[PDB]
Design a protein around this ligand. Structure first.
Ligand SMILES: OC[C@H]1O[C@@](CO)(O[C@H]2O[C@H](CO)[C@@H](O)[C@H](O)[C@H]2O)[C@@H](O)[C@@H]1O
Ligand SMILES: [Ca+2]
Length: 1098
């Protein structure tokens, strides 16, 4: 393949479309082998290509062709020969006062880049060496660095702050110059310190140096110290916070090691046993979407001491009043009643049983409906299989969510017209509870159903808006949940709120048909509905301060549910796709049922279409109420017209003409004159609700719980009593956060108390409050940004808003502990239809803790959210300074495990404590108290961006510095810092080459990278490994089965092809290791295959 130029076809510096560099001799023949061009040697393979990073003997010359494609003599040493002493006049002075904990700021003995130490003397005001006081600490990085590049970067950085030599240093620069320039930098530092009377400025500029960034040869900002930033913590992205560590044991860090057979990750309901078990049958799915590492620092709920602490916590919540306000004689009225188990799919399912046991023990919930229905818990179980795990395995100790209902309501009603399912879908088979002919009790699986929630169908709508406005910063919805700038939310919200006010056909972001959905939800049989604050009030702004467009319609339904909704049910959808849901009224379970005395004035009927151009065209819609409703007058509760939805609240508000009367089969019959298609803010399609005329004020459709003893597996039973319950989720993420000096009546828990009667009027029986735990403000996630401190991101699980130490009121987002106790008392003081108090639900959040105050050394592996090793070589059981230890002066320390001694002694709890837990196969363990959270109680954590090499360590010895131990497994301090002889560099010897780190220690059994960039290895004897003629270049070095290619000068080549003296070719990856049974892509798009042997294919 000759090479011709455009102007003329000459060959005598030729290129190719791939980049391959041919050079043809005079007259057009390509050359191969070793060639000399302009006094440089260049290697051309047998294909003709000029090649870079290629090593081999050619004509009895070992030549390494570098990135240039230019030969270097492998025999000649490529390192600087000579040592350099690290002892100077000042090292006697800068040496540590003492070589122990008292003179070094440290992490479990280990050191980090932000370690400060106490020298024996201070250069006071840069002019006189004085003995250092106790407080005369200086940053380690002022006098010591882990290698020359960091020292160099440090020198230039300090100089750029006016504290230095205005000239440029690099790892190329000499060891002795860097040391002398450091001293000049030290004078300037110390003069600044005398002037300011402070080192905060210095701490600030050392901290900011570490994370500093740099322009490079390419011209883009890199990290100046990659090993000390998140940049170095690379692995899988599949975790909400872009990475995750698993804590693992290691002899270097004895106190962070967990016991044997703890840290059982992924014990989700489906996989509690250790293996998936589909509990689901023919129509239903048995999938599990769970995973152990969700957010923040992951509590290990497979540890039995932790499990007991989870119990302890539930007891504390259920007795929060009596515990926190003993002097108060009404303390017993300020206790939580129920729990919401949170992130069920992200914790050991053993907790679901721990909790079920507790309520059987404390409140005897197992004996009947009356007791069971007095404490209604709910699971946050998203996975399809959990519904059936809950039933078969877990009794029904907590209520499962009906997600088939939620998704159907969303797909058939809320979507835009393009995306929307048919109303027929409501009669389908995959639905959890068949309602076409629901005519029994105690058959359905007990469940709560809802449409939206603080998280579900809210925070993701907001995040989509942020992402669509700033794709460059946040390109997905999951990544937008990490947005922290209050400006970004305000902006998104003015859009969100504006969209909600728009007609349905122009609703670009927010849900359609919300009242229509709520009409079906609130009139459905066999479920406990949950209402989201944000469907009555706006998701943002002040608590209960602004109504949505749906408030009238939804509140109308909510009160109407109280009066009319009872009895059997039937759903239909006529030829026109118009849904008709009917409740027959109490005492009547079918359309052919004559009923009781209660039936006549009860039993609602609902009409829903989802088609904005519904044109009946001589067809009729029919509401078959019962034969128990024949010849009966009916009147509307809700109706849609072009202005919106009308809500009639009494018989007398209805104009007489709108009344209409059933025929003899109890059928209502609607014309095209009545039902048509619409497009408003609140309805695309039609909506109507009809109630029977003549109901009384006394009338209440609900039913009292049975006292009869239940000998069943399930705690709850889907019947009339249970359908009489309703849950109201009483909060939003984006409620405005009462500012520091907010007046007392902004706080949501005060507002709650005021409006207590309103919730009772709506039929609320279980008030689901927000989590009450004081929030982090670190913005590591949505829940923890300061403009939404919702309480799912906390450090102290026992602190629900206590006053400060000085006795100043110091609230949470929602109010003080006082204000909470009162909120509970107000709700408790309200009494529902059966005379009993409105329940108050605690958010039980066992999964994680955010934002802990103290560091601890731990061993880590880089993984994804499921726990799967991301297989980063440099993050395999390494040591990390993790923020993972609680203060030990927090409320955890007071109340942690406090009641376990008390609870064991109780006879009623014997079952609970004696119970063998499924995943642990051991019982719960209440004999240890948890007053300080430590790393040993955590499965792992999200990546904290400290850096891999944040924990300091000597490259030559390859051990970690440790100031608290003298054990050999750690390196002792740098010889310079303890005023001993210390030299650094490569030193050639009659036997071979040794190397001493900047710390003064000998390289033994390690790889070492030169300042020039070449790697070298040092054997057990402390000598460089180097191939000889007797021993070829292809070599194992460390009993690892890993072959490297080491030239005669000791250079261990990387990202490079190497040769046998025989003629075979091998490729050595980024880590210098030989490649085997694989294809290699070249920069110029050439492909090479390497066999299992490691040889290149041909
Ligand atoms: O919020 C994101 C994600 O987490 C889930 C897990 O069930 O929500 C629960 O757990 C989170 C951390 O505790 C909280 O943000 C959230 O408020 C809580 O409901 C999912 O609902 C959600 O997809
Ligand atoms: Ca977990």
């Amino acid at each position: 393949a000759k090479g011709f130029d455009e102007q003329g076809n000459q060959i005598k510096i030729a290129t190719d479309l791939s980049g391959n560099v041919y050079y043809f001799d005079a007259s057009g023949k390509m050359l191969t082998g070793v060639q000399n061009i302009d006094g440089k040697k260049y290697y051309f393979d047998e294909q003709g290509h000029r090649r870079r990073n290629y090593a081999g003997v050619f004509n009895n010359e070992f030549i390494y062709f570098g990135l240039d494609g230019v030969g270097q003599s492998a025999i000649e040493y490529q390192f600087e020969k000579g040592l350099t002493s690290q002892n100077s006049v000042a090292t006697s002075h800068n040496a540590a006062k003492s070589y122990d904990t008292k003179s070094f700021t440290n992490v479990d003995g280990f050191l980090t880049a932000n370690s400060w130490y106490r020298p024996t003397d201070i250069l006071r005001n840069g002019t006189k060496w004085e003995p250092s006081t106790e407080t005369d600490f200086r940053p380690l990085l002022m006098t010591w660095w882990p290698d020359k590049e960091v020292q160099a970067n440090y020198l230039n950085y300090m100089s750029a702050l006016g504290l230095g030599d205005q000239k440029i240093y690099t790892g190329a620069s000499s060891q002795l110059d860097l040391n002398n320039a450091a001293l000049i930098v030290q004078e300037a530092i110390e003069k600044k310190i005398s002037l300011e009377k402070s080192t905060k400025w210095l701490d600030d500029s050392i901290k900011s140096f570490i994370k500093s960034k740099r322009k490079d040869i390419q011209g883009n900002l890199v990290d100046t110290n990659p090993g000390w930033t998140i940049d170095s913590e690379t692995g899988s992205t599949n975790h909400l916070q872009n990475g995750a560590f698993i804590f693992t044991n290691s002899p270097l860090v004895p106190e962070a090691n967990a016991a044997e057979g703890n840290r059982l990750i992924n014990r989700t309901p489906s996989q509690q046993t250790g293996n998936h078990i589909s509990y689901a049958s023919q129509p239903y799915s048995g999938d599990d979407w769970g995973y152990e590492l969700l957010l923040g620092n992951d509590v290990d709920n497979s540890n039995p001491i932790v499990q007991a602490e989870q119990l302890n916590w539930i007891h504390y919540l259920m007795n929060f009043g009596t515990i926190t306000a003993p002097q108060d004689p009404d303390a017993h009225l300020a206790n939580f009643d129920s729990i919401r188990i949170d992130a069920v799919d992200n914790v050991d399912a053993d907790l679901l049983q721990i909790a079920g046991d507790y309520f059987k023990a404390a409140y005897q919930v197992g004996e009947n409906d009356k007791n069971a229905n007095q404490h209604i818990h709910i699971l946050q179980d998203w996975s399809p299989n959990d519904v059936w795990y809950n039933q078969q395995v877990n009794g029904n100790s907590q209520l499962t969510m009906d997600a088939t209902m939620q998704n159907q309501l969303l797909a058939s009603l809320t979507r835009p017209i393009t995306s929307r399912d048919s109303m027929k879908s409501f009669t389908k088979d995959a639905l959890l509870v068949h309602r076409t002919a629901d005519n029994s009790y105690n058959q359905a699986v007990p469940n709560y159903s809802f449409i939206r929630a603080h998280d579900s169908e809210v925070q993701t709508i907001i995040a989509k808006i942020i992402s669509d406005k700033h794709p460059d910063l946040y390109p997905t919805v999951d990544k937008a949940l990490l947005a922290k700038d209050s400006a970004l939310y305000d902006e998104a919200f003015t859009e969100y709120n504006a969209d909600m006010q728009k007609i349905s056909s122009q609703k670009q972001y927010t849900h359609n048909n919300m009242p229509s959905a709520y009409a079906i939800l609130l009139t459905n049989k066999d479920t406990v509905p949950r209402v989201y604050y944000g469907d009555l009030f706006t998701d943002n702004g002040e608590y209960m301060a602004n109504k949505t467009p749906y408030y009238d319609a939804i509140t109308s339904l909510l009160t109407a549910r109280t009066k009319f909704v009872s009895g059997g049910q039937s759903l239909s959808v006529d030829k026109n796709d118009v849904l008709t849901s009917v409740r027959y009224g109490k005492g009547a379970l079918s359309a052919t049922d004559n009923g009781s005395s209660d039936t006549r004035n009860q039993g609602i009927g609902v009409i829903v279409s989802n088609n904005p151009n519904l044109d009946l065209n001589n067809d009729k819609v029919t509401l078959s109420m019962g034969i128990s409703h024949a010849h009966q007058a009916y009147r509307p509760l809700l109706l849609t017209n072009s202005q919106g939805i009308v809500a009639y609240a009494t018989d007398s508000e209805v104009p007489q003409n709108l009344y209409k009367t059933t025929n003899d089969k109890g059928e209502l019959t609607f014309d095209a004159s009545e039902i048509k298609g619409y497009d408003t803010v609140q309805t695309s399609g039609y909506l109507a609700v009809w109630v029977p005329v003549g109901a009384s004020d006394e009338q209440d459709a609900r039913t009292i719980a049975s006292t009869e003893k239940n000998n069943g597996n399930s705690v709850y039973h889907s019947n009339a009593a249970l359908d009489s319950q309703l849950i109201y989720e009483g909060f939003s993420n984006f409620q405005t956060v009462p500012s520091k000096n907010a007046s007392a009546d902004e706080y949501a828990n005060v507002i709650i108390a005021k409006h207590a009667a309103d919730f009772n009027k709506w039929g609320v029986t279980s008030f689901q409050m927000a989590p009450q735990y004081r929030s982090s403000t670190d913005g590591s996630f949505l829940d923890a940004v300061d403009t939404v401190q919702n309480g799912y991101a906390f450090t102290d699980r026992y602190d629900l808003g206590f006053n400060a130490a000085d006795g100043s009121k110091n609230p949470t987002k929602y109010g003080t502990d006082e204000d909470l106790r009162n909120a509970i008392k107000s709700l408790h003081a309200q009494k529902t239809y059966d005379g009993s108090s409105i329940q108050v639900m605690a958010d039980f959040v066992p999964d994680q803790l955010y934002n802990m105050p103290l560091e601890q050394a731990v061993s880590v592996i880089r993984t994804d959210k499921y726990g799967v090793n991301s297989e980063n070589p440099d993050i395999q059981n390494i040591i990390y300074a993790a923020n993972i230890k609680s203060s030990g002066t927090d409320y955890q320390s007071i109340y942690g495990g406090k009641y376990l001694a008390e609870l064991q002694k109780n006879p009623l709890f014997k079952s609970l404590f004696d119970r063998i837990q499924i995943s642990t196969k051991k019982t719960i363990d209440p004999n240890t108290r948890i007053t300080q959270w430590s790393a040993k109680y955590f499965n792992g954590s999200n990546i904290q961006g400290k850096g891999i090499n944040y924990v300091l360590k000597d490259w030559a010895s390859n051990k970690y510095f440790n100031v608290s131990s003298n054990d050999d497994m750690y390196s002792r301090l740098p010889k310079q810092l303890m005023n001993q002889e210390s030299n650094t560099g490569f030193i050639v010897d009659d036997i071979g080459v040794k190397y001493y780190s900047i710390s003064g220690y000998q390289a033994k059994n390690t790889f070492v990278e030169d300042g020039n960039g070449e790697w070298y290895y040092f054997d057990n004897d402390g000598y460089m490994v180097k191939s000889t003629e007797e021993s070829g270049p292809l070599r194992t070095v460390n009993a690892s089965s890993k072959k490297y290619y080491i030239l005669p000068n000791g250079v261990e080549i990387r990202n490079s092809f190497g040769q046998d003296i025989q003629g075979n070719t091998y490729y050595f990856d980024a880590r210098g290791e030989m490649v085997t049974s694989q294809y290699i892509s070249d920069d110029t798009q050439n492909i090479y295959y390497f066999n299992n042997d490691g040889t290149m294919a041909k």
